[PDB]
Structure 1
Amino acid sequence: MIINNLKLIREKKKISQSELAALLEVSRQTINGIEKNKYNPSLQLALKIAYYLNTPLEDIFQWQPE
């Protein structure tokens, strides 16, 4: 039903828009893909933020078909 997500990590990190905007050193419009990327964010989507976030993708990776 639900799986771990970097945005949830953001929630865990308690990072607000100003801070997220700080994270957003990558094209935000890429997120706009969420229209169709509403799935758990792709690694490319995840990596850009995950790069900044103190959280390995490996641990983060949700190998869930859902």
Structure 2
Amino acid sequence: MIINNLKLIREKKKISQSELAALLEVSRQTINGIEKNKYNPSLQLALKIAYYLNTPLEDIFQWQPE
């Protein structure tokens, strides 16, 4: 389904997971865990990630509407 790949998006600007996680208000381990296939971020949080990260939601988490 949804492909979690913030790190690519974040690392695009060389954004730190730690700072980003601070931006998200969530633990870094969890955020980097999601790419690894851990349960994707919540409805608002994904929106926040796009907002905090400043990137389309699709790039960070391509919904892949199956």
TM-score category, normalised to shorter length:
0.3 to 0.5
Kept in 1: contact 2:20–2:52 (CA 8 A): no
**Larger radius of gyration between Structure 1 and Structure 2:** 1
The Cα RMSD (Å) is 4.6
Unaligned runs of 5+ in 1: none
Unaligned runs of 5+ in 2: none
Aligned residues between the structures:
66
Identity, % of aligned positions = 100
TM-score by length of structure 1 reads 0.46
TM-score by length of structure 2 reads 0.46
Question: What's the CA shift for 1:53?
Answer: 1.7
Kept in 1: contact 2:20–2:53 (CA 8 A): no
Distance 1:25 1:44, change over 3 A: same
